[PDB]
Curated annotation (Swiss-Prot), chain A:
RCC1 repeats lie at residues 1-49, 51-100, 142-193, 278-325. Changing residue 289 to A: Does not affect interaction with KTI11. Together with KTI11; associates with the elongator complex and is required for tRNA Wobble base modifications mediated by the elongator complex. Association with the elongator complex is mediated via interaction with KTI11. The elongator complex is required for multiple tRNA modifications, including mcm5U (5-methoxycarbonylmethyl uridine), mcm5s 2U (5-methoxycarbonylmethyl-2-thiouridine), and ncm5U (5-carbamoylmethyl uridine). Together with KTI11; also required for diphthamide biosynthesis; diphthamide is a post-translational modification of histidine which occurs in elongation factor 2. GO terms for biological process: protein histidyl modification to diphthamide; protein ubiquitination; tRNA wobble uridine modification; ubiquitin-dependent protein catabolic process. The keyword Cytoplasm applies. This is Protein KTI13. Changing residue 225 to A/C: Abolished interaction with KTI11. The gene is ATS1.
Swiss-Prot record, chain B:
The keyword Glycosyltransferase does not apply. The chain holds residues 2 to 57 of 82 of the full protein. It is found in: Cytoplasm; Nucleus. Belongs to the DPH3 family. The lineage of its organism: Eukaryota, Fungi, Dikarya, Ascomycota, Saccharomycotina. The keyword Nucleus applies. Present with 8400 molecules/cell in log phase SD medium. One of its GO terms (molecular function) is 2-(3-amino-3-carboxypropyl)histidine synthase activity. Residues 2-56 form the DPH-type MB domain. Pathway: Protein modification; peptidyl-diphthamide biosynthesis. Changing residue 3 to A: Impaired interaction with ATS1/KTI13. This is Diphthamide biosynthesis protein 3.
Length: 325, 60
């Protein structure tokens, strides 16, 4: 895969070897195929289809490597893992993997070794996925969602509590298959395989009420730290919920071309359109550090950052943007 | 107005520097000094970006 990266880079988390913030896509080079890219506050990891995990950036909380004397992984380097990796997620200063044996491991947050998180899971080969943001992780298998970490806004369960070290069952649909969990810094939205919202919890952004948003099928839900975005491909719209102090509400001016992909970082969004074949990638929201393009004033609207001959995959981090071809 | 509001009980106390901190979406941390908070300061600032947060306390 060909990977481009830009935005915040004070800890060399863009994998470019230098520590300068960048405002246009830069080729970042670890023939491995990228499964996905996950981002924490100041570290980045790339998982390839072969099961290898590579990372770069801050290691002062044990995000990437067991050597306490290693403060930062300056360039892309393999992450030592207990077994081949099938899925990965990051939190603020943490990295969590699902391995090929179906075991879940966490490092970071001051812990320098991968430690097993004992999630109740079946050994029947039902897909096991992990999602993470800020100080929470969830693990999904079948109809069940387990989670751990902060609970100060009742995102995992009620009543509030500072932190839950051991996994708790957040939701069991008792029926429909869960597709994924979209996570904000202190809230989450559970989506089924039909694109319907089945549950939501925590400090939900202003204007979003679970019971008013469970009607429509075929949605895609994305979350920034403090906002929810609902992409409706049938109508070619993105509906946003949040305060929008820094242009995070998706711009409502009519798009002339179909949206074929959406991703979010901490406080920005990344949009891909098909202009048929040519694909355009745009950013909206908070872009002080260059993660939305060269216009860094967080002005509203979609800012074009790249054009590609094939359909890209996009990923967002903490004021970082990733484009994978 | 401000980027967000954060509950004082959700911030992390750093006893070395005697300040409360909280992650910022830029990768750094918002900060409010203990002495400033004691005296009535209700805004935390980020050393790496222009975002600011209001610090609050809710009984609910
Ligand atoms: Cl591969
Ligand atoms: Cl272990
Ligand atoms: Cl357009
Ligand atoms: Cl600018
Ligand atoms: Cl533009
Ligand atoms: Cl504390
Ligand atoms: Cl925190
Ligand atoms: Cl602000
Ligand atoms: Fe900041
Ligand atoms: Mg409940």
């Amino acid at each position: 895969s060909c990977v481009y990266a830009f935005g915040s880079n004070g800890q060399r988390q863009l994998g470019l070897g230098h520590d300068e913030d960048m405002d246009t896509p830069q080729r970042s080079v670890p023939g491995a195929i990228v499964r996905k890219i996950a981002c924490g506050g100041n570290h980045s990891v790339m998982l390839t289809n072969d099961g290898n995990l590579v990372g770069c950036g801050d290691n002062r909380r044990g995000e990437l490597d067991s050597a306490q004397a290693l403060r930062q992984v300056h360039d892309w380097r393999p992450v030592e893992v207990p077994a081949p990796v099938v899925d990965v997620a990051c939190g603020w200063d943490t990295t969590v993997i699902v391995d090929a044996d179906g075991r879940v491991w966490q490092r970071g947050g001051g812990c320098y070794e991968f430690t097993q998180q004992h999630v109740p899971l079946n050994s029947n080969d039902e897909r096991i996925a992990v999602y993470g943001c800020f100080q929470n992780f969830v693990v999904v298998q079948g109809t069940r969602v387990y989670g751990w970490g902060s609970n100060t806004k009742c995102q995992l369960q009620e009543p509030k509590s500072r932190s839950l070290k051991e996994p708790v069952l957040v939701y069991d649909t008792g029926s429909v298959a869960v597709d994924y969990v979209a996570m904000g810094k202190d809230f989450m939205v559970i989506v089924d395989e039909g694109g319907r919202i089945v549950h939501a919890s925590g400090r939900l952004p202003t204007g979003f009420e679970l019971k008013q948003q469970q009607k429509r099928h075929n949605l895609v839900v994305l979350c920034m730290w403090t906002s929810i975005h609902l992409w409706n491909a049938r109508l070619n719209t993105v509906e946003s919920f949040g305060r929008g102090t820094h242009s995070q509400l998706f711009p409502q001016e009519r798009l002339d071309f179909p949206i074929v992909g959406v991703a979010t970082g901490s406080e920005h969004g990344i949009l891909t359109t098909a202009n048929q074949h040519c694909y355009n990638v745009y950013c909206w929201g908070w872009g002080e550090h260059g993660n939305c393009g060269p216009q860094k004033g967080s002005q509203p609207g979609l800012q074009l950052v790249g054009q590609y001959s094939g359909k890209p995959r996009v990923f967002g981090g903490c004021a970082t943007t990733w484009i994978v071809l | 107005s401000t980027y967000d509001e954060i509950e004082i009980e959700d911030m992390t106390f750093e006893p070395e520097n005697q300040m409360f901190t909280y992650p910022c979406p830029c990768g750094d941390r918002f900060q409010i000094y203990l002495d400033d908070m004691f005296e009535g300061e209700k805004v935390a600032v980020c050393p790496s970006c222009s975002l600011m947060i209001d610090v609050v306390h809710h009984h609910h």
